[PDB]
């Protein structure tokens, strides 16, 4: 099975530079056309650059022409994007993409998981993780809701877990919103009422850009 896994993304300053990598397996890499496509925060997709099987031909969008460089090593089964003079507009999730052979299949056959690029003057900041518990006069029905407030981090992403996975089926983690220059998001979980007093409920919160990880037990009031 074809698999593409990209890496090297993270925060970088304006005017800055950073090289992305895409690792390929499950197919004869030397036969294929390869491209980078980026998805903006607002979900628009755009092909930044492409390269053929033998590095004989490369294409760049006009917005990246002269700042980016695409390369490949057919022996290592790796593709690269060398970026420079980074602008805020470059901020995106970058996928590497395979083309099918010979107009056979679709002009982009397979995509990776993406690696994230944040171009910004703002600084890497870990979050504060506050516990959200109901007041002592709480909502005593068959189920109770609890949460954590993950506030003041930068850049994306965060990951939120609850009791390290076991509580997945009742979790809503809401997408982050941007304030002064910091993301806040929240996350709820529901658990039978007859469980919350006597049982631990714990949000696991990681922020990879700051190598943060904290787990906050939710305590009643």
């Amino acid at each position: 099975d074809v698999k593409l896994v990209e890496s090297g993304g993270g925060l970088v300053n304006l005017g800055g530079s950073l090289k992305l990598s895409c690792a390929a397996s499950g197919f004869t890499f030397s036969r294929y056309y390869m491209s980078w496509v980026r998805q903006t925060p607002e979900k628009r997709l755009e092909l930044v650059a492409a390269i053929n099987h033998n590095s004989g031909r490369t294409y760049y969008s006009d917005t990246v022409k002269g700042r980016f460089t695409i390369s490949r090593d057919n022996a290592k089964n790796t593709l690269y994007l060398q970026m420079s003079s980074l602008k805020s507009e470059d901020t995106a999730l970058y996928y590497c993409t395979r083309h099918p052979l010979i107009y056979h299949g679709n002009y982009l056959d397979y995509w990776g998981q993406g690696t994230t690029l944040t171009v910004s003057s703002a600084k890497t900041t870990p979050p504060s993780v506050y516990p959200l518990a109901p007041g002592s006069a709480a909502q005593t029905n068959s189920m109770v809701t609890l949460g954590c407030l993950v506030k003041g981090y930068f850049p994306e992403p965060v990951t939120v877990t609850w009791n390290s996975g076991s509580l997945s089926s009742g979790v809503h983690t809401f997408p982050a919103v941007l304030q002064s220059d910091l993301y806040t998001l929240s996350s709820s979980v529901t658990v039978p009422s007859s469980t919350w007093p006597s049982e631990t409920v714990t949000c696991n919160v990681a922020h990879p850009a700051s190598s943060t990880k904290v787990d906050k037990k939710i305590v009643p009031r």
Binding site: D62, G112, S128, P134, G147, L149, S186
Partner: protein
């Protein structure tokens, strides 16, 4: 460049029904027996998958419920019947001219029955007050029609500055939506008022769902 505009931006279709997504191109894209238009499906947090290539060729493995058509400047994707896991943003891509161009995408919302939100409200944590801040959080969970309204009232006085709302993507398991609204203010501000109220209005009730606490009560 070939601008690719996708209407509508979102479409809500019931399970069993048909969905159709349009992709209009600013110039013709039809290179003879081949119109080079691709459709891609993206579930949130997932990487896009190839759905249809060269306008109407079904890629290997995709269900026959997905089909593609069109010529010149007008192209179309159909899914029929729609099923649960078609919740996604579908994209059209041109590839007859450099630069290869994408449409802005069209979200397909799954149309289920009306369901009212479960509302819950949460005081500022001791641990936040200690740092000199105060956020009050309200959860409107598992509701349908995405459409809602949250009123944040302080001592029975609507307030709106410092309010941050977020919406989740439609739920894969039950096709509902969910939202959080968070009122933030400083600790001192928090300490000048008694009642903090989250009110939710949804098309399934004329009576608002009202959830509150008093800072002074117990």
């Amino acid at each position: 460049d070939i601008v690719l505009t996708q209407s509508p931006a979102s479409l809500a279709v019931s399970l069993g029904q048909r969905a159709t997504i349009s992709c209009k191109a600013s110039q013709s894209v039809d290179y003879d027996g081949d119109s080079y238009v691709t459709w891609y499906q993206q579930k949130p947090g997932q990487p896009p998958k190839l759905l249809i290539y060269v306008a109407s060729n079904l890629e290997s493995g995709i269900p026959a419920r997905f089909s593609g058509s069109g010529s010149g400047t007008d192209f179309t994707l159909n899914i029929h019947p729609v099923e649960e896991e078609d919740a996604a943003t579908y994209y059209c891509q041109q590839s007859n001219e450099d630069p290869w161009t994408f449409g802005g995408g069209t979200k397909l919302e799954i149309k289920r029955a009306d369901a009212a939100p479960t509302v819950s409200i949460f005081p500022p944590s001791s641990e936040q007050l200690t740092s000199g801040g105060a956020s009050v959080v309200c959860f409107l969970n598992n509701f349908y029609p995405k459409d809602i309204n949250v009123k944040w009232k302080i001592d029975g006085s609507e307030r709106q500055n410092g309010v941050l709302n977020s919406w989740t993507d439609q739920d894969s398991k039950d096709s509902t939506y969910s939202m959080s609204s968070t009122l933030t203010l400083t600790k001192d501000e928090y300490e000048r008022h008694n009642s903090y109220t989250c009110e939710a209005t949804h098309k399934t009730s004329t009576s608002p769902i009202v959830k509150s606490f008093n800072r002074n009560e117990c």
